[PDB]
Amino acid sequence: PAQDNSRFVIRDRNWHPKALTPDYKTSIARSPRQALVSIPQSISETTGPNFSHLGFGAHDHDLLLNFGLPIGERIIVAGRVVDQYGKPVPNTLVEMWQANAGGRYRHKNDRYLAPLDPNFGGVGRCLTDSDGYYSFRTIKPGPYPWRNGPNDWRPAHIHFGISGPSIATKLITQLYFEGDPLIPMCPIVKSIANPEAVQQLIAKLDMNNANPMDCLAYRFDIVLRGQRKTHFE
Amino acid sequence: PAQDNSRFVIRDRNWHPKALTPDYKTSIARSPRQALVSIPQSISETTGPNFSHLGFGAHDHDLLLNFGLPIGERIIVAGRVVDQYGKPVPNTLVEMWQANAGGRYRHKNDRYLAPLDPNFGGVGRCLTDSDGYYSFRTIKPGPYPWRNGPNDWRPAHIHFGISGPSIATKLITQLYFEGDPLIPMCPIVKSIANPEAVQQLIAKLDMNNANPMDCLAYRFDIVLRGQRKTHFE
Amino acid sequence: PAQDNSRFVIRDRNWHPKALTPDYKTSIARSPRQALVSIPQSISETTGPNFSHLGFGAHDHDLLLNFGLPIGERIIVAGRVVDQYGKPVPNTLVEMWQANAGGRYRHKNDRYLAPLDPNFGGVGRCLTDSDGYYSFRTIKPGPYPWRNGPNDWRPAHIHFGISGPSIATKLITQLYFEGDPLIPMCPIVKSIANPEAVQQLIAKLDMNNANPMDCLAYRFDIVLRGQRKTHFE
Amino acid sequence: PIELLPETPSQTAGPYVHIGLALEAAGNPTRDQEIWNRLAKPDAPGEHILLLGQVYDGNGHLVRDSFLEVWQADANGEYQDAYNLENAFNSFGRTATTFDAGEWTLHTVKPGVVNNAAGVPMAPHINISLFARGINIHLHTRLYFDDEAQANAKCPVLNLIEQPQRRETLIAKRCEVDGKTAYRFDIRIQGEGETVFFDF
Amino acid sequence: PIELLPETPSQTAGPYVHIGLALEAAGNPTRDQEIWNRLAKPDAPGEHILLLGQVYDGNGHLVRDSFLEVWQADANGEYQDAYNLENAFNSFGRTATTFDAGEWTLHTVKPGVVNNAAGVPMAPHINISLFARGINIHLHTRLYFDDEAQANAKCPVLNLIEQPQRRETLIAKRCEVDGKTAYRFDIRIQGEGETVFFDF
Amino acid sequence: PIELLPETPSQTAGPYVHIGLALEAAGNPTRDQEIWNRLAKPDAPGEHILLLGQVYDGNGHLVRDSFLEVWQADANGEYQDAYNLENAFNSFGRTATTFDAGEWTLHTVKPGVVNNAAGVPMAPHINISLFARGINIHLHTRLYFDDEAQANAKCPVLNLIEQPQRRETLIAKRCEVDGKTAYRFDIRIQGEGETVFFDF
Amino acid sequence: PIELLPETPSQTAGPYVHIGLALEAAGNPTRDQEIWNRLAKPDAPGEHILLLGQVYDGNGHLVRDSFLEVWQADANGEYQDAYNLENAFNSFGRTATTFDAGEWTLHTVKPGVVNNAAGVPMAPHINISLFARGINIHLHTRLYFDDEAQANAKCPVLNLIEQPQRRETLIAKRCEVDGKTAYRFDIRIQGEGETVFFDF
Ligand SMILES: O=C(O)c1ccc(O)c(F)c1
Ligand SMILES: O=C(O)c1ccc(O)c(F)c1
Ligand SMILES: O=C(O)c1ccc(O)c(F)c1
Numbered sequence A, B, C: 001p002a003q004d005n006s007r008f009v010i011r012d013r014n015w016h017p018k019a020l021t022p023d024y025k026t027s028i029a030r031s032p033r034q035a036l037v038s039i040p041q042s043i044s045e046t047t048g049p050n051f052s053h054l055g056f057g058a059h060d061h062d063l064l065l066n067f068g069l070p071i072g073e074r075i076i077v078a079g080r081v082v083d084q085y086g087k088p089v090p091n092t093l094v095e096m097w098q099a100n101a102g103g104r105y106r107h108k109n110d111r112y113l114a115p116l117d118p119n120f121g122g123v124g125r126c127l128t129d130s131d132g133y134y135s136f137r138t139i140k141p142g143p144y145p146w147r148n149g150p151n152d153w154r155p156a157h158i159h160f161g162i163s164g165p166s167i168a169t170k171l172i173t174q175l176y177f178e179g180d181p182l183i184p185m186c187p188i189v190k191s192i193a194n195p196e197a198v199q200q201l202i203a204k205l206d207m208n209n210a211n212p213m214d215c216l217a218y219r220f221d222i223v224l225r226g227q228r229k230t231h232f233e
Numbered sequence D, E, F, G: 001p002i003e004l005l006p007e008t009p010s011q012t013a014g015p016y017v018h019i020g021l022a023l024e025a026a027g028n029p030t031r032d033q034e035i036w037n038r039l040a041k042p043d044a045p046g047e048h049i050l051l052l053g054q055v056y057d058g059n060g061h062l063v064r065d066s067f068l069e070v071w072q073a074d075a076n077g078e079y080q081d082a083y084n085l086e087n088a089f090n091s092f093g094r095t096a097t098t099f100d101a102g103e104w105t106l107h108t109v110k111p112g113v114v115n116n117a118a119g120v121p122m123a124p125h126i127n128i129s130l131f132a133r134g135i136n137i138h139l140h141t142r143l144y145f146d147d148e149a150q151a152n153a154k155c156p157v158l159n160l161i162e163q164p165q166r167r168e169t170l171i172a173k174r175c176e177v178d179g180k181t182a183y184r185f186d187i188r189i190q191g192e193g194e195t196v197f198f199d200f
């Protein structure tokens, strides 16, 4: 079984978006009114699942093959998962989901008038290698209208979920694309008060990683809470 | 018939890209080695076709219906055509063509592996209205690789053709999308030596013109040679 | 009857003051706690009254005559009503109300010790001309204390109401006067978070419009939501 | 992106809005022609009704200085924009709450059905804009009728409200006043039973 | 002071989280191996229980797009991190609320006692992480059992909550479902009876 | 100096210009009305002729993706700007080179003489604009007829060309096709025999 | 975008390249082991051939200070990277032009066929790198054999060259020298018959 041999650097709750960000209407009713109760880290908090033995399909990370070919911009989304100390996070679970080229999701609840793509599901999973590296092959998702203000559009994004070494490190986020004009207008993006924090969510065009005559590539590194050994406890 | 009543401001050939722009490989063998011969303007040059009586189909300017629905980000491409003096150019012909959401062209010669979209042709035409306004409804094309350097990619773009009031004004150009990181890297774009000139080719995201819960909109205004009356000739 | 031919640019709710702006005490209990529900524009929202046929009295817009002469600085408040596209809004209803020179209001509930003015009422109305212009003749209101903080004073101001083309454009605002040192201290002014927005409410001294040896003049232009034609709807 | 000129920022109407928009109310002499709360003259086609209500702040206290503006279709589901006191019916009106009782009143006819932009019929409704001191930017809402349950059930706008429970905040309760058909519409600005308000 | 790399900021999971993490629920085909709500195989040691609940918003309305992740020790108070579908027991699981009923379910065993960093035993509990649209950064909670009062009274964690009244919110209420031992644990995100959420 | 709004910068038509301006050629279905290479209908006044030619690059290799636009006077030396398919003759047209043969063809009538601004007659000519991948900004040329030597000898335009040798690059060589009067006009973009290109 | 460390910029080899990379040529004593022009020892498998050529500047003048590097597969279409003078065959060699005649020579074997990344066969070829004073960045080319016309016709690389005539430039001309099979391969840096140079 797991062992309590680590401590995770405390989260900076002014970096991350706050719970109540009124412009993002749903956050109104879905945010606590009481302050969070801080508690010391214990084995309960400092351990988490290891997905090394999950049986991954061969195309789990290839959205082009996992659902003919999807319509849209062929891109590789790659990067690395590190901790705050800059140490790689190997064998970690990276799960992603997104819409198709037209901003339509393959989900019951998605009523957007843009059509589904017969060859696209929009789900991917990949386990980081020994150097904390991950990669997915997909199509660049389209922006989509949503019922917030009368004319809100989510910038093109890819939903990301990362396990890390403990439940303490577990994070759900969104990757955005470099130069997209919708970014600065999105209320969800703006849930993040520090423009500097916003930058961390922008994947950069990576020409070096592209397959000439085939697909472009984007680079998105992910930093998880810093992991250190216990001391003088 | 037509009459020689106007004169057109001389073209600034340092604004426009030069014929020989070596980074754009094909320009090498397809650019003259002799200087152009300047000639005075006559009726031959100061008149052109008026497409007022061309018989336009009802969906000529609607790429979503003129070819189900295309997959890809639904956008409105709108704007105005004016001359250098700021005068609108009413009843002028604007023709556009582009690739699909995947950067695939519906053309024999297009061998790019991204698939064709069964509901997408990629051609539109619209005659500006009395205020020099034009509009198209299409999907945002995808970038696409091309045999230039070993890893050249065209930024997403829509090809444009504008008649104007005379053959002296006729112009062919390309529209680019605001924030697209590929713009600065393209050798075609870079055939234009003035950064300021390049900016004229960038369509701006226009939320004001978008149809909420339906499609976004880009504004792309075009400027043709200023037309003036002859004087003391 | 009225026709659903138009769409109005969506209001920028971060430009306008928010509902909850604590320093303005009354707003606390008079602001909703649930998010506003966004609804698509219909005929219900895109139409509104036309007051062309309202029977306006001859001195409706002249506060010096419409109630002896009032005591106070004789001024002309003129301007133009336009939309966000810069389009004049002809035949629209402009209604104003203010206090007297002493900051006293001719209203029951006004208990300020500054005396009433025998010849001053404080209400005016004017229908914009074909070019979107309006003008009033009145006296510059005085600032006045109010039970907010213990020493709060509203800058001198005129309350304005503008109908525009539809209930979607309808607006209630307040005109402040150039250089008023009380401006930056007012909690009502400050309900508006962008200083640039504040600037919009400041009437500018306009010597070009003054009547030498009679009265000064101020210029106040009003911008209503941009009106566009529906397209691809 | 493209940016148009910014809309002139809203400001509260203040406690004295009456002097400007409801002369009687202010206790001031009125002009020859005024925009008031009688949308329909007795000889107007349609079912003549009386509308009444109260406005409540977040503390459950009466807002005695509110100012309301209404917009509704005639009995045929037609919007009569040509405002004239000569008219039998005007689609536009104004009312305000008594400084005493804290109740506003409106004399109109029940509006007929109107279709949304998509051709889908909306349940009969009255478009209301609320103004008052403490309210920085006017609040938009709609009044629907309890006796149009069938129509209400299928209103595309009403159906946009996620929580069924909140839809009920928009339905006026039918009653009689002096043997006249009346509907009571109370607006709760904040808190328990907070009235749904719109953005368009 | 020393500054480390900033952690990647959290974002809402959004309404379509199902697509990536709760495949069935999305109404999409699943893969060979999925992480789901059955932590324990019927032959796993310990006291098998069925856990269930609803998630309420600040208005008291069910949250039907919630997504949850659990982490608990096995029956011997041991965290089994090597996740494998072959195992009789996995310490980690996932669940989500029905779009209809708005209820979630978990099939597990009652966790054994684990000690805190100080060597002090904590009452048996399940670590919960809640995600959903409108939730910018996941809320952390703990589920304790009403039938472990003695242990609960002395939990160093539960004891960190100032108001005893708030401790109550963390206690699952024992019941029976088809003659099976069940504990119901409802989450109130906001307001009356708001559930305690942690930071660590 | 006074500076006006700058003209939108030009860009190459690219290889797929066909799809936009030569539907047939792109091998795509055409629309009802299309502007193509038949400017004259058989019952059109004047001497009908067939123009044809190829386009060479600086290496003397055929340009198979070229696109051309023409503008000419009718037989009376008059420009017909009101483009209409019904018309017996249209002053404007479009043609492209075959991806195989690499030859363009146009069906029209020999243009009448028009005078320059100074009132001096110009030899019959056809204004041409060349587009193609590798051509950043389109090339302007004019076609002249070899059987109009006298006129050509006196053209105010052709006389603007300094070196006489270059002038000849502008003369189409009369021939016959299927017993029809044809004129061959080969454009050399660069090098030996480079065609005169104009700026106006 | 993402930027890596920029590569060290190339510079011309200069006229004295020989001192560094072609000892004998410089007219200097050589070291024990030198990388020269004999890729195959007498007992190496495959067909032993002699390669010879001249280098031409844009004026049609011999470039007498050129330096060339070759890379080719052995007779089995296998790349031998472990460089050793002990080997019977080395896939790598070096040659230069005489200051007098201006001709370079290579002693090797006809390379076997190698597949491209896509699994398609490439005609027998030798990868050449050309260096000299006046050349800022080395020129890359390929030497194909005239006696492999069938293979050549299907070379996925040769086929990337748009103009068929340019392909000819890459074909070495079989001849005999002292009754030995030889191929002549002349490089024309500029002008008429300019050799195709690649980028990869
Ligand atoms: O973060 C906030 O703004 C916040 C948090 C808790 C509260 O109870 C509150 F009213 C505001
Ligand atoms: O624009 C140039 O660089 C250019 C133009 C004509 C020439 O003959 C030339 F050598 C260069
Ligand atoms: O605008 C705000 O700050 C605001 C709006 C609604 C709420 O319920 C709230 F708590 C805050």
Ligand SMILES: O=C(O)c1ccc(O)c(F)c1
Residues within 6 Å of the ligand: C026, C146, C147, C154, C188, D012, D013, D014, D015, D133, D134
């Ligand atoms: O009390 C208020 O809210 C108040 C008083 C005076 C004003 O002019 C006003 F706008 C508001």
Ligand SMILES: O=C(O)c1ccc(O)c(F)c1
Residues within 6 Å of the ligand: A026, A146, A147, A154, A188, E012, E013, E014, E015, E133, E134
């Ligand atoms: O409605 C939401 O809250 C919502 C919609 C789409 C998203 O991509 C998202 F993250 C949130």
Ligand SMILES: O=C(O)c1ccc(O)c(F)c1
Residues within 6 Å of the ligand: B026, B146, B147, B154, B188, F012, F013, F014, F015, F133, F134
């Ligand atoms: O190869 C070219 O010249 C080329 C390719 C694609 C384009 O969109 C273009 F404009 C030119």
Ligand SMILES: O=C(O)c1ccc(O)c(F)c1
Residues within 6 Å of the ligand: G012, G013, G014, G015, G133, G134
């Ligand atoms: O002549 C030359 O090109 C030359 C001479 C000396 C050098 O070092 C060199 F790099 C080039």
Ligand SMILES: [Fe+3]
Residues within 6 Å of the ligand: C154, C159, D014, D016
């Ligand atoms: Fe006031």
Ligand SMILES: [Fe+3]
Residues within 6 Å of the ligand: A154, A157, A159, E014, E016
């Ligand atoms: Fe999303």
Ligand SMILES: [Fe+3]
Residues within 6 Å of the ligand: B154, B157, B159, F014, F016
């Ligand atoms: Fe293109």
Ligand SMILES: [Fe+3]
Residues within 6 Å of the ligand: G014, G016
């Ligand atoms: Fe040197």
